[PDB]
Assembly symmetry: D2
Homo-oligomer: 379 residues x 4
Amino acid sequence: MVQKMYREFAENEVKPLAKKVDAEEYFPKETVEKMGKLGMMGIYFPTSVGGAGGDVLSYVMAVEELSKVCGTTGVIVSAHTSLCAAPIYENGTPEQKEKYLPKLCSGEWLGAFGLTEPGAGTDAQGQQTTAVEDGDYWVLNGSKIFITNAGYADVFIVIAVTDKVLDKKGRPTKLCSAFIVERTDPGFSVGKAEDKMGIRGSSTCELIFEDCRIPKDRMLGVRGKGFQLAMATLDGGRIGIASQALGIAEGALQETVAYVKERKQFGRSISAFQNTQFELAEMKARIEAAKYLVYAAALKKQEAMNGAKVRYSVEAAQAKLIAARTASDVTRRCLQLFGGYGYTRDYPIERMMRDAKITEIYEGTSEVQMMVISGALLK
Amino acid sequence: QMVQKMYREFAENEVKPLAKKVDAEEYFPKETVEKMGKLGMMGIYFPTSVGGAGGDVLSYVMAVEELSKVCGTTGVIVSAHTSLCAAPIYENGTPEQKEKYLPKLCSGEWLGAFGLTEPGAGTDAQGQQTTAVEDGDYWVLNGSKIFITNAGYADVFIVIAVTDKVLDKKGRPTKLCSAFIVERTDPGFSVGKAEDKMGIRGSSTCELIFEDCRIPKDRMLGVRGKGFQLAMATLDGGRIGIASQALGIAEGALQETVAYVKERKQFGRSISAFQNTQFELAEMKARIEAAKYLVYAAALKKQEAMNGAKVRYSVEAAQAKLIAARTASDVTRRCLQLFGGYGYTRDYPIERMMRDAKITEIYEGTSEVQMMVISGALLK
Amino acid sequence: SKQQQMVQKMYREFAENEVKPLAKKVDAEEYFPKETVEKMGKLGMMGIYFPTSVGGAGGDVLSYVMAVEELSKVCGTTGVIVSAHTSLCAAPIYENGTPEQKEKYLPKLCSGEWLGAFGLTEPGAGTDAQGQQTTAVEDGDYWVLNGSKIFITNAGYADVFIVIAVTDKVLDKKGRPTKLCSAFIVERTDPGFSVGKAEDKMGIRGSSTCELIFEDCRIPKDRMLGVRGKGFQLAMATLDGGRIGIASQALGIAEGALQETVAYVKERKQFGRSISAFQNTQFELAEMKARIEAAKYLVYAAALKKQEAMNGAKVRYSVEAAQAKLIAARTASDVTRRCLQLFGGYGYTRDYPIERMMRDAKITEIYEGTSEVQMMVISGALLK
Amino acid sequence: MVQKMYREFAENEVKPLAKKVDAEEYFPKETVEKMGKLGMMGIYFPTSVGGAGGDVLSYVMAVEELSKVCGTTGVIVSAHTSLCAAPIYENGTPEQKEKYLPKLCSGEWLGAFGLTEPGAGTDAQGQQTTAVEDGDYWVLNGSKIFITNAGYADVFIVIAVTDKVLDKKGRPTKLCSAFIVERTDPGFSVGKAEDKMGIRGSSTCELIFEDCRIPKDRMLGVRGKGFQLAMATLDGGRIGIASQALGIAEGALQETVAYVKERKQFGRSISAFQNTQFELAEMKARIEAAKYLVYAAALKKQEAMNGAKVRYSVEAAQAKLIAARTASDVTRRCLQLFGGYGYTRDYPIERMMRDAKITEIYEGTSEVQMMVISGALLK
Ligand SMILES: Cc1cc2nc3c(=O)[nH]c(=O)nc-3n(C[C@H](O)[C@H](O)[C@H](O)COP(=O)(O)OP(=O)(O)OC[C@H]3O[C@@H](n4cnc5c(N)ncnc54)[C@H](O)[C@@H]3O)c2cc1C
Ligand SMILES: Cc1cc2nc3c(=O)[nH]c(=O)nc-3n(C[C@H](O)[C@H](O)[C@H](O)COP(=O)(O)OP(=O)(O)OC[C@H]3O[C@@H](n4cnc5c(N)ncnc54)[C@H](O)[C@@H]3O)c2cc1C
Ligand SMILES: Cc1cc2nc3c(=O)[nH]c(=O)nc-3n(C[C@H](O)[C@H](O)[C@H](O)COP(=O)(O)OP(=O)(O)OC[C@H]3O[C@@H](n4cnc5c(N)ncnc54)[C@H](O)[C@@H]3O)c2cc1C
Ligand SMILES: Cc1cc2nc3c(=O)[nH]c(=O)nc-3n(C[C@H](O)[C@H](O)[C@H](O)COP(=O)(O)OP(=O)(O)OC[C@H]3O[C@@H](n4cnc5c(N)ncnc54)[C@H](O)[C@@H]3O)c2cc1C
């Protein structure tokens, strides 16, 4: 009753704004605040922490419905929910939960997450942002690159190097910890918005820590287990991105069906040619196959959230790998069915193709997803 | 999930040892068909009230999938018998027809088969010319069916024949078909020689010849003139079974490949240690899971329709049949590569799984047909 | 290979020195590179395979194909600016023009002072090139053109246009009314002719693609190019040459993307090593280069068939072009997407050119005949 | 002329034996008898060693036309020519040339080549068959596996380990040497024919060396340079296999175009549907692109053998990679167009798909070809 339900909720919230968001690199604060007033920034979190008391699948559906019409809007929510609000709720203390989750789930605060560094993006373990103890404070130094929501975010999750310890075989190893960084923390700046191929309305900025001293109780999770917390967070985030890729491919298919039904070239609708029919049919099935992967991932996560001791990293990895590749594949072929008109800004299909490309890259590339799947498989 | 591990144990202990002989000798596995019947597996999702085992459609799907992991021949025998012969009788039969055929069919004493395809028109399933004529209290059948699964070993057949000669309101001449239950002991009915196929070679794929086949009046299944509608509703359920067959062939191919690359060594390391091997297996695994969810989703939409929920599952079946068949052919080809030269010989079963995977793209409606069904609903 | 390897270098140096430093500004600013076209004109690169007798540079068709390839390795916009100008405006004039029409337009087209363009596509039917409605009517000593063309490359900066208009309304063998077309040389200065709204496009954004408007466009009688009623056959013989140019543009985009990728993966590190030390990166590059090399041979072969036809050997090259256009365009889109993948997040930003190349590669599958058109050409010949 | 005419020769040889050669695992010895008398066993070899005096391209065309009808016949010629006769000519002394090349190019002697071992197939540098000096003789011991033509071959090229030396810095390494082995050499045995998925008429057997005492002069090439001789031999053979794959795909496309013109389902030919036309058109374009790669490599090796000093390993690697992947893809999509009739032995398409599978593996798998190509590219 929450799953079937919210799908219409999210379907009615629609996209008269997607063209200007993309064309003008414009962050949609109107949509974000409407979402806060609607509970869409706190969906699967319990009401005891400020959330809307929904389930993980309803969150996935919301992202997918938004991403059908604006990939940028889907990633703003997804990143804020899965990458900032989720690790607080999943590893934070009652005090940490109460101080941060009510304002994140209501929309009052926007959340971001910084792991990626210039030389340690895929090698997220070999990073160089550091954190040292100073009495009752921590002192951070370094930078984070390509951080979603960063220009408009109020709270940031930051992974920094806290200890340099030894491994079993004497090789020095770096241990990280997660830190809750507020936008007002001194010595913390947000750089300029990057110029991207797509999801342009999304604020992708650099983080700069120049002696950012934060209170001692901003440490999230177990000291030195920050890498494990980061990888656990990305597992939930990868379900979010997979649901984004799914909506882009679904939105692209939606528009293409409408277009081929009305345009006629040889005296008949373009939909009357067999090639058009087979392309749309094969694409739809591929999209359906990806939809169930995404849906299966979301509820395996729900199982883990409900106390069951199950792992969902593999399911999430499979979902993001297949959804992202399906999204790029569907958008390219759908643009083909538009002909020359699909190469212009009159229609959204060109934006959707640019937007689809990112889902294969960010929050862990497809290659990293295959490392996850094969690791479980070959073990 | 409890029935699934039963099937897995049965398929590995009782079916897998026989797959090589079944394929290499074009050997119908009469033995295991008797064993499965004793285990109630030829009637899985039919209720106990008609002689079934009282399972659900998915347990049947999981059984076909699990059998097909080790023997594509065994999987299709169960699938065709269940979805193409037993299902149409349960869906459109009279209480007399159900009580006579369903208990023996679900028990396994009688094997089932479906005749639709003819030589002149196989994809054009509405341009066929096998006929049934009124004669007193009997029907007279005449024609031929081609490529019939289980034909050489089936006791009861579902036969689609042209009965009425009508012409549509548009103006074009239209053939109306009817479905008929034909028993192997019928006069003027014979089964041809087994075809020589590329894969699923133990499956008995033969001709059906009707030369003045005289059958009773009460052998007509369903409404007169709707026989083609009966065939297309039967095929929708069958395509779910073929989808789970393709899924199982891909699943078993990957399983053997993962095993092989861990133990076989090259350049000093296991082949599993090379990044290209890991990514091929990873990508194939994700594609197989995507197909699996499609298959189970279709199986449950059909379960809804069987429980009273008036939904259609044609498109869900069409999607599952389409994706799972192309995944099977893709996976087995790439899995064979990871075997190297050893995968080209009969020592391993990868070459049989590749040959078995191709048929899933074709029979019970080609992938092109599946795209016709899907786009017809989408573009409506 | 030949001293054609000497001219191949010219296009590579020129692309790397004069064109490559401008590609980002061309794309980001939707900026027609008016400075490079003038440079290429002074270099005779807008007349490459036309003879000196008609004031070209006296090269071969293969040289022009490589010129487009080398330019499209760095800037797809610059590549298509030459390709349409050469293969879609100057080629039909040279192929079907009277000595006056040749002497008048070719000296300016091959020099660079005049830029060319081709109008076929209309809104109501672009793929269905037999159902258009731009009309041309006899009026005394002049022709009167009315209608519109859409998507025309170079339209906002071109001086002379090849326009296909419906002249003859004739009855066919089956009794249906068929429309016959004629080709006309329209100068930017003709009364009643206007280039119109440009297009904000996905890629090749520096290219000037605008609509053409004919509102009582009155042009001389001797502007007609070719025979009356056979303008459509002229347009399809023009497109056969142009599809070789776009196949080379696609080939170049795929080639330049691979060069950039191989450079990036050798210098960028992770997990202790260079990204080129991982097997997946190696097999991705190796397979793309093998596909690209196969597309090159198709493109190059279509060029030689075209040059065989020009040298008097009566041979058809429409299938060879369609094969080139189909495979090269699908290779470009595939290579650029997979190359961007190997860049990680850095490929999604404007810092590097791979995202521009991926956006540019998508057009080669579409303009001057979609890939579905190409397959129609190829299957028609095969099933005949 | 030698190109445009030998195409006519090769297109003409017609035997209706392909079906039973593959169905009965029957080596077509009469076909080899006929081809030897036509001079098809030494085509590109000069007349002063006993060849026909043809070019490398005609050999490629002979394999391509034979493989268009019977992939088994194409591989017998290719293996015998490119893997046994070629290294005799290219590395043998005039004494070795005079003794072996006339009978090989005339078809009296069938050639074979052994490099692959049970544990060193892709890792052809880590094998264990050895050869030691004994008076005026060598002694060979070990085993080779998967050796084409071995069941009916008279002369064999055997790679054996002759020296274990130290490399530049100090690791022990194994050096190999080539050896000409005759069928009548004592202690040399041929095993049973393997049961293969396809090219089943070809004699794929194991070689066993139990005190294979051969005269001292049967050493081929420079001592300790056997492995270098191996890869250079496989370079030529890879062009041959590429031709086979090209032939298989071409013959596949041929039968399919014929079949779709004649078969009617919906009141019109299956050629009349758009899906069929696009499938055939795209495959034709794919095949044509492979054909150029095969020919280009063939003429690069013709340059080689005319004295010009260029390497054709990369060209041969690209040719085999693309052709093998095009053959498999084409045969599968052509079987689809046959419908249920293509799954039976009535038509040759299913045998074609089984034959296409082999070209991706032997004489260097696609992964080995990508190792070669990326080696040159990344260097
Ligand atoms: C950047 C750009 C520059 C251009 N420059 C020029 C120029 O300089 N000159 C010029 O003349 N044109 C130009 N064009 C137009 C271009 O050639 C057309 O866009 C192209 O021919 C496709 O036609 P269309 O855009 O009208 O789409 P449509 O014709 O509407 O095609 C829509 C889709 O339907 C498919 N389709 C159509 N008919 C069939 C059929 N019978 N069977 C199956 N599928 C079918 C098409 O392949 C396509 O996928 C340009 C276009 C672009 C985008
Ligand atoms: C092993 C095996 C077992 C079988 N078992 C059974 C059984 O138990 N019962 C039964 O009834 N049948 C059975 N068949 C027959 C099978 O169902 C038919 O063969 C199949 O439905 C179509 O095959 P065909 O050759 O008749 O179709 P064809 O139409 O001859 O197919 C030729 C090709 O044309 C394509 N095509 C056809 N029409 C169109 C169109 N309008 N648009 C585009 N493409 C089109 C098809 O997709 C196919 O690629 C079996 C076949 C095999 C091989
Ligand atoms: C739009 C956008 C939003 C982003 N948002 C965020 C955010 O909110 N939070 C955050 O922390 N980061 C974010 N990032 C950064 C992002 O996480 C990284 O870009 C991504 O994870 C990969 O980082 P990279 O590009 O440095 O990796 P690189 O390692 O530079 O990737 C280059 C290529 O090498 C491959 N590769 C690397 N190692 C191997 C290997 N061992 N084997 C095979 N292939 C390998 C990769 O898969 C890729 O194909 C964002 C990036 C973008 C573009
Ligand atoms: C019909 C047939 C005929 C043959 N005829 C001959 C003949 O005449 N002469 C001869 O010498 N040989 C012959 N062979 C052997 C053939 O050359 C080998 O089968 C082939 O080279 C692969 O070696 P393998 O079979 O040991 O596979 P393996 O090396 O056991 O397989 C390794 C697999 O892993 C893949 N892979 C991916 N990454 C790597 C990596 N980093 N390192 C290693 N592998 C990797 C490989 O591509 C391959 O798929 C024949 C084989 C067959 C099937």
